[PDB]
Structure formats: C-alpha cells, structure tokens
Scaffold this motif. Structure first.
Motif, PDB file in Angstrom:
ATOM      1  N   UNK A  65       0.855  -1.183   0.000  1.00  0.00           N
ATOM      2  CA  UNK A  65       0.000   0.000   0.000  1.00  0.00           C
ATOM      3  C   UNK A  65       0.894   1.237   0.000  1.00  0.00           C
ATOM      4  N   UNK A  66       0.909   1.943  -1.122  1.00  0.00           N
ATOM      5  CA  UNK A  66       1.726   3.137  -1.271  1.00  0.00           C
ATOM      6  C   UNK A  66       1.375   4.185  -0.222  1.00  0.00           C
ATOM      7  N   UNK A  67       2.403   4.668   0.471  1.00  0.00           N
ATOM      8  CA  UNK A  67       2.244   5.661   1.531  1.00  0.00           C
ATOM      9  C   UNK A  67       2.579   7.077   1.080  1.00  0.00           C
ATOM     10  N   UNK A  68       3.256   7.199  -0.061  1.00  0.00           N
ATOM     11  CA  UNK A  68       3.645   8.504  -0.580  1.00  0.00           C
ATOM     12  C   UNK A  68       3.968   8.463  -2.068  1.00  0.00           C
ATOM     13  N   UNK A  69       3.928   9.628  -2.703  1.00  0.00           N
ATOM     14  CA  UNK A  69       4.241   9.718  -4.116  1.00  0.00           C
ATOM     15  C   UNK A  69       5.702   9.403  -4.356  1.00  0.00           C
ATOM     16  N   UNK A  70       6.533   9.703  -3.363  1.00  0.00           N
ATOM     17  CA  UNK A  70       7.963   9.435  -3.439  1.00  0.00           C
ATOM     18  C   UNK A  70       8.205   7.918  -3.450  1.00  0.00           C
TER      19      UNK A  70
ATOM     20  N   UNK B  52       3.367  13.713  -7.552  1.00  0.00           N
ATOM     21  CA  UNK B  52       2.635  14.846  -6.989  1.00  0.00           C
ATOM     22  C   UNK B  52       1.139  14.545  -6.881  1.00  0.00           C
ATOM     23  N   UNK B  53       0.593  13.901  -7.911  1.00  0.00           N
ATOM     24  CA  UNK B  53      -0.826  13.561  -7.940  1.00  0.00           C
ATOM     25  C   UNK B  53      -1.173  12.554  -6.853  1.00  0.00           C
ATOM     26  N   UNK B  54      -0.309  11.560  -6.679  1.00  0.00           N
ATOM     27  CA  UNK B  54      -0.506  10.530  -5.671  1.00  0.00           C
ATOM     28  C   UNK B  54      -0.506  11.162  -4.285  1.00  0.00           C
ATOM     29  N   UNK B  55       0.379  12.132  -4.066  1.00  0.00           N
ATOM     30  CA  UNK B  55       0.445  12.820  -2.775  1.00  0.00           C
ATOM     31  C   UNK B  55      -0.844  13.579  -2.499  1.00  0.00           C
ATOM     32  N   UNK B  56      -1.386  14.229  -3.529  1.00  0.00           N
ATOM     33  CA  UNK B  56      -2.627  14.980  -3.391  1.00  0.00           C
ATOM     34  C   UNK B  56      -3.786  14.032  -3.105  1.00  0.00           C
ATOM     35  N   UNK B  57      -3.815  12.914  -3.826  1.00  0.00           N
ATOM     36  CA  UNK B  57      -4.851  11.899  -3.667  1.00  0.00           C
ATOM     37  C   UNK B  57      -4.797  11.250  -2.278  1.00  0.00           C
ATOM     38  N   UNK B  58      -3.598  10.870  -1.837  1.00  0.00           N
ATOM     39  CA  UNK B  58      -3.435  10.246  -0.527  1.00  0.00           C
ATOM     40  C   UNK B  58      -3.826  11.192   0.617  1.00  0.00           C
ATOM     41  N   UNK B  59      -3.507  12.469   0.460  1.00  0.00           N
ATOM     42  CA  UNK B  59      -3.809  13.464   1.479  1.00  0.00           C
ATOM     43  C   UNK B  59      -5.253  13.963   1.492  1.00  0.00           C
ATOM     44  N   UNK B  60      -5.947  13.880   0.355  1.00  0.00           N
ATOM     45  CA  UNK B  60      -7.327  14.367   0.281  1.00  0.00           C
ATOM     46  C   UNK B  60      -8.379  13.332  -0.114  1.00  0.00           C
TER      47      UNK B  60
END
Ligand SMILES: [Mg+2]
Ligand SMILES: [Mg+2]
Ligand code: NA
Ligand code: NA
Length: 331
Positions: free
Chosen positions: A48-53, A67-75
């Motif tokens: 389970x991916x925890x960050x875009x990095x 960047x998109x994954x980070x936005x998706x994971x956070x919102x």
DNA sequence: CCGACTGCGCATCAGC
DNA sequence: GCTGATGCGCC
DNA sequence: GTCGG
C-alpha cells in the motif's frame, strides 16, 4: 496471483481515468500510454503506497504522477480530475469514444455540434459511417466479456466451417483465449493456405470464401471492414430454443502468408508484455521479432533475409530458448 | 533539452 | 478519376 | 508524462 484492488485501486483508477482523458479529450496518446504504464506497475506493487515518493521508485512513475498521488493520498481525490468529470464537453467526448468507430476526432465533432449521447447518435445516423453505426447498434454488446465456454463454442463453428470450405486451410484462434483465459474481449482468428506465400498469388478469394461460409451459416452477422487480407466484423452464437439470445461479438479474421504464419500466431497470441519482453530478449541474442518475420542482424544492424519458420517452436529455438506454453505467456 | 513512445489494413477524407 | 493523408482499431 | 540519449 496479483495484488488486490484494495491496495492501490484508488491510485490505479485515478491514473486510468486520466489515461482515458488524455487519449480521448486531449488527443495525447503518448500521455495515455504513460498513464497506463504507471497504472500497471502500481497494480503490481504488492504494498500500500504511503507517498508519491515511494511510487516514484517504480519504472513509469515520474514527478508529475508522484505529486498527484500525494494529493490523492492526502485528500482522497484529485482536483484536476474532479473538474474533468464535471465538465460536460470532456465527459461527452470521453463517452462517445466508447462507440467502436468513434475515436477522439469524431467524438470532438459530435460534441461541437451538440451530439453528446447515444440518443443523439440515433437521431443523426446519417452523420455516422458504417463502422460507427455497427458500434452504436451493438454498443452494450461490445462492452461485455466473452466467457471461455462461449469462445469454445465459437471456435467449434469457425474451425468447422473453414475446414468445410477447403480442408487445406489452417486456422488458429489466438488472443487471450489461446493463453487459457477464463474470459475474452473478442475473437482473433489467423488463417493461411498452402497456395498463399509471400512470393506467390495474393488471391482475394481465400479470405472472401471463408467469411462467406460463416455468413451462410449465420455466424457472421456484420462487417466493419474487409479487404483481401484483414476482416473485422461481428458474430453471434446461435440461439437455443426458449433460452435467451447471445450477445453479438467482435471477431477479426486474418489471412497470413504461410511463411509469416507462425510469427503471426505468436504475435496475436500475446501477451503484449510477453511480446515486448520477448522482443527485448530477442534483442540480446541478436534478433529482431515482429508480427511478420524474424531476421538476423549483422552487428551494424543489417537484417538479412527473414529466417525460415515452420512452427512457433522454431522461433523460440532460433533465439536460444525453450517454447513457452501459451497459458504461461502472461509476462 | 528533447525525440521516442510500432506500424499497418481498411475506410473515408482532401486535393489534384 | 486518381493518389496520398487521416482516422481508427489494434501487440 | 516518463525515460534516456
Ligand atoms: Mg492536445
Ligand atoms: Mg486481439
Ligand atoms: Na520512476
Ligand atoms: Na471508439
């Protein structure tokens, strides 16, 4: 096996939606494949991916997608996509492309003219070409999967009729069906005859006769396109008394020169990844493989005359390799 | 920074 | 009338 | 959009 949709399905779905939007609305096919690539490698990620990095480490995922994954994971969503889904123009265009025959360009014109739904299409049949009408007529049918049992019954009919036209024909149903799939999107049939080779007669009758027999026994119901080499159309299993009618199916039939038949079989059997990986491996051993032939490179890159092929095994052997069973050609 | 990302059959358009 | 381009579906 | 020359 494969990681459950539960793991990174939200991310993979997001990437697939953006993939469709790029191809259907932006008309950026390379960005479409870029997104699909990213979705695939993530669909294989067993964590389970925890960050875009974290995802960026994967081949196919770069800064933008990180960047998109980070936005998706956070919102839980992506603003740019959330805005695309609500856009009437982008949604309509995107939708119309689901009709076989309607691509990015036609979808664009229809929407520019107000034609945005299947209903709009029916009221404007004169504005559709032959392919598009068949796509419309069978919109729903074309989006249904084909269970293996039906593919088996379909193969029965095809092999039976082809042999009936001329017992010297050689027919091979390829695609995922040949790879032992439990379901299929369509039926791809490869055809050859001893009298048809690269340096022989072109004969428009060989493909025509077979298509005709399948139409005579009511198996083939429609024609999308048909030349001397390729045929694309529709077919349907006969109805059992009292039982419900079968969904109409997409079927393609290809007439291939006997000397390019096995390279064709291998190719249209896939998988695309298996083909890519097999082409990539073929490169190391000093060989190039495509849909038609296998050719030897001469260090500079001078591919000589196509090497003789008489079976799929011959190909595997040439490149110093063991024949892979179709059911294992997943990767 | 910037090109590749497969390339082809068939249908249909654009232009001579 | 023709030839070449474009759109489309596809490993 | 990503990768690689
Ligand atoms: Mg664009
Ligand atoms: Mg196929
Ligand atoms: Na990456
Ligand atoms: Na379409």
């Amino acid at each position: 096996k494969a990681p459950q949709e539960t793991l990174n399905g939200g991310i993979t779905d997001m990437l697939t939606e953006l993939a469709n939007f790029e191809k259907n609305v932006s008309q950026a096919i390379h960005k479409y494949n870029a997104y699909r690539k990213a979705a695939s490698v993530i669909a294989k990620y067993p964590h389970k991916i925890k960050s875009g990095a974290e995802a960026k480490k994967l081949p196919g995922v770069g800064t933008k997608i990180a960047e998109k994954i980070d936005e998706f994971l956070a919102t839980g969503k992506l603003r740019k996509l959330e805005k695309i889904r609500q856009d009437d123009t982008s949604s309509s265009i995107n939708f119309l492309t689901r009709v076989s025959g309607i691509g990015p360009s036609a979808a664009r014109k229809f929407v520019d003219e107000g034609i945005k739904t299947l209903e709009d299409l029916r009221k404007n049949e004169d504005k559709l070409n032959h392919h598009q009408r068949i796509g419309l007529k069978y919109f729903g049918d074309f989006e249904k999967r084909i269970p293996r049992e039906e593919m088996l019954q379909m193969q029965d009919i095809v092999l039976n009729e082809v042999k009936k036209v001329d017992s010297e024909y050689i027919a091979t149903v390829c695609g995922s069906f040949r790879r032992g799939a439990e379901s299929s999107g369509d039926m791809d049939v490869l055809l050859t005859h001893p009298s048809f080779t690269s340096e022989s007669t072109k004969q428009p009758k060989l493909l025509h006769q077979v298509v005709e027999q399948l139409q005579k026994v009511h198996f083939i119901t429609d024609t999308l396109s048909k030349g001397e080499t390729k045929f694309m159309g529709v077919c349907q299993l006969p109805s059992k008394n009292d039982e419900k009618e079968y969904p109409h199916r997409r079927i393609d039939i290809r007439l291939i020169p006997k000397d390019q038949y096995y390279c064709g079989v291998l190719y249209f059997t896939g998988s695309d990844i298996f083909n890519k990986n097999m082409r990539a491996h073929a490169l190391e051993k000093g060989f190039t493989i495509n849909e038609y032939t296998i050719r030897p490179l001469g260090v500079t890159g001078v591919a000589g005359e196509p090497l003789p092929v008489d079976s799929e095994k011959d190909i595997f052997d040439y490149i110093q390799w063991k024949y892979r069973e179709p059911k294992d050609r997943s990767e």
